Design a protein around this ligand. Structure first.
Ligand SMILES: O=c1ccn([C@@H]2O[C@H](COP(=O)(O)OP(=O)(O)O)[C@@H](O)[C@H]2O)c(=O)[nH]1
Length: 454
C-alpha cells in the first residue's frame, strides 16, 4: 500500500533539490508527497516536479526575525553569517506546520533541523524521519554521542582524530579542526548551539535516514545505528532526475564551441562568497592552465560585481576562452555537456553526486564546512576519485600555483595520478549507475518505511 509522506527540508537549494529528486523517485513508485516549501521559492521548484498528480507543493510564509533581510526565504537570499537567523525563522513556522500536519495527516514526515517536530508528530500519530542529504561520515564525525558528552571540553586537538568507534581513518588539517570546534558552539536558530540542535534531532526522532548506498555510506550508517539505537536507513544515492527545462541556449551554444573534454568548470555552490585574495588566486590559477573555463562564482566579500573584482588585465588576457559568471545556472546540465573535462568543486554533497555520475575529472576545493571537508577527504583519500588543492595547514588558503597544478594533473592524459583518479572515478560511476543499485536501495528503503508506519 502506498504511503503519504510529507517533506520539510531546510531552506536551502542544497536540501530542497535532493529532497525533490527523492520525492520524484517515491512518486514513481506510487507514493503521495506533500512537499512543504517557502512560498516564493515554489516557482523555481516546479521545473523539477515530474509527478504533479502525486507531488503537491504547500507554501510556507517565512516569518520575520530581527536581522533577516526582507522577504528572505532561503540561504541563497542571505549572507552565510545570517544562516542562524534564517533557522530562527524556520523554527517560527511551527504554527503553520502543525496546521498542515493536522489537515494533511501524512504517515511520515522527512525533516531537517526542527527538533521540536517529533513532539508534534507523535501527538498526531505521525512518524518523524530525520533525513540527511549530507554524508553520514560527517554526522558520524561531529555529532555522534562520544562528541556530545564532552560538551564544551571538546577542543580542536580533539577534532583532529575521529570519535571512538569511527569506521575509517583520515586526517584533518589544524584550521579545519579549529573550524569544527568553534562553529559547533555557535548559536544556530533560537539560541540553540548548532551541535546541540542536531543532537536533539538525532535523539528525539523516530528514525534516521541518509542519502547514500551500502557500498560507500554503509560503514557510517552501521556505526550510527549502533550509537543511537534506532533505524538508520539509506535512500540510495539520489541520482539527479531530469528537469523539464532544457539547457539555456546561451550556455549550450558557447559550450559547444569547445573541443570535447577541454573545458574546466568551477562552481562553489549556491551560498558562499570568496575573500578577494582567494577569488584572485582561483581565477589566476585557472588562467595559468591555458584551458578554456567557466567559473560560476559570486563576487568576493566587499564587492557587488564580478567585473570590479577581477584581477587587473584579466578579461583582456582571457578573451573568449574563459567566463566568470555570478548567476544561478543549470549545473547538472552543464556537467553533462561533452565539452567539460574538469570540475573544480567546493565538495557539496549534491555537487559531488553530479560530478561522480559524469565523466569530468574532479578537482577538490572544499570550503570551510564540515561536510565539504569530510567529503573532500573521502573522495581524495578513500575513493581516490579526485585531486585536492593544497591549503595552508594553519591559514586554510591556497595559491594560484596549487590550483593550476591540480587541474594540470587531472587534465594531463600522460599523468599517472590523473589516469588513476579517472579510472577510480569510472569504477564509482559504474557502481552508482549500475542497473539495479538505486532501484534495490529504494526497494529496501520503502520496506523499512513501511515497517516504520506499522
Ligand atoms: O548555479 C548553481 C549553483 C548550484 N546548483 C545546484 O545547487 C546544489 C548545491 O548543492 P551542494 O550540496 O553541492 O552545495 P551547497 O549549495 O549546499 O553548498 C546542486 O544540486 C547544484 O547542482 C545549481 O543548479 N546552480
Amino acid at each position: 500500500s502506498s504511503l503519504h509522506i510529507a517533506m520539510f527540508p531546510w531552506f536551502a537549494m542544497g536540501h530542497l533539490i535532493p529532497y525533490l529528486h527523492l520525492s520524484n523517485k517515491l512518486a514513481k513508485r506510487g507514493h503521495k508527497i506533500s512537499f512543504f516549501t517557502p512560498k516564493k521559492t515554489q516557482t523555481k521548484l516546479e521545473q523539477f516536479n515530474l509527478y504533479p498528480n502525486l507531488i503537491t507543493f504547500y507554501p510556507l510564509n517565512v516569518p520575520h526575525v530581527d536581522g533577516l533581510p526582507f522577504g528572505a526565504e532561503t540561504t541563497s537570499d542571505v549572507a552565510i553569517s545570517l544562516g542562524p537567523i534564517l533557522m530562527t525563522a524556520m523554527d517560527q513556522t511551527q504554527n503553520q506546520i502543525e496546521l498542515l500536519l493536522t489537515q494533511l495527516k501524512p504517515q511520515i514526515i522527512f525533516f531537517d533541523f526542527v527538533f521540536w517536530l517529533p513532539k508534534i508528530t507523535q501527538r498526531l500519530g505521525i512518524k518523524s524521519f530525520l533525513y540527511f542529504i549530507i554524508n553520514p561520515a560527517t554526522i558520524s564525525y561531529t555529532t555522534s554521542p562520544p562528541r556530545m558528552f564532552e560538551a564544551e571540553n571538546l577542543t580542536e586537538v580533539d577534532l583532529m582524530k575521529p570519535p571512538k568507534g569511527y569506521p575509517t581513518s583520515f586526517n584533518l588539517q589544524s584550521h579545519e579542526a579549529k573550524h569544527l570546534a568553534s562553529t559547533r558552539k555557535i548559536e544556530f536558530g533560537s539560541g540553540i548551539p548548532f551541535s546541540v540542535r542536531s543532537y536533539n534531532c538525532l535523539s528525539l526522532t523516530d528514525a534516521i535516514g541518509f542519502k547514500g548506498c551500502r557500498e560507500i555510506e554503509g560503514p557510517y550508517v552501521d556505526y550510527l545505528q549502533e550509537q543511537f539505537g534506532k533505524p538508520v536507513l539509506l535512500s540510495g544515492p539520489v541520482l539527479p532526475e531530469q528537469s523539464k527545462t532544457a539547457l539555456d541556449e546561451k550556455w549550450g551554444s558557447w559550450l559547444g564551441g569547445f573541443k570535447d573534454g577541454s573545458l574546466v568548470y568551477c562552481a562553489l555552490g549556491s551560498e558562499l562568497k570568496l575573500k578577494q585574495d582567494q577569488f584572485h588566486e582561483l581565477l589566476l590559477g585557472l588562467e595559468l592552465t591555458g584551458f578554456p573555463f567557466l567559473a560560476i562564482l559570486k563576487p568576493p566579500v566587499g564587492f557587488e560585481t564580478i567585473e570590479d573584482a577581477l584581477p587587473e588585465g584579466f578579461k583582456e588576457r582571457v578573451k573568449e576562452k574563459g567566463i566568470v559568471h555570478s548567476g544561478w545556472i543549470q549545473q547538472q546540465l552543464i556537467l553533462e555537456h561533452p565539452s567539460v573535462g574538469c570540475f573544480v568543486t567546493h565538495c557539496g554533497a549534491g555537487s559531488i553526486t553530479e560530478g561522480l555520475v559524469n565523466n569530468c575529472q574532479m578537482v577538490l576545493l572544499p570550503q570551510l564546512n564540515g561536510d565539504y571537508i569530510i567529503n573532500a577527504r573521502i573522495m581524495g583519500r578513500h575513493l581516490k576519485v579526485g585531486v585536492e588543492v593544497k591549503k595552508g595547514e594553519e591559514d586554510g588558503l591556497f595559491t594560484k600555483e596549487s590550483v593550476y597544478e591540480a587541474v594540470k594533473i587531472v587534465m594531463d592524459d600522460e599523468n599517472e595520478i590523473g589516469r588513476e583518479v579517472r579510472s577510480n572515478h569510472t569504477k564509482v560511476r559504474n557502481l552508482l549507475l549500475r542497473h539495479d543499485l538505486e532501484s534495490s536501495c529504494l526497494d529496501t528503503f520503502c520496506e523499512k518505511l513501511q515497517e516504520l508506519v506499522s
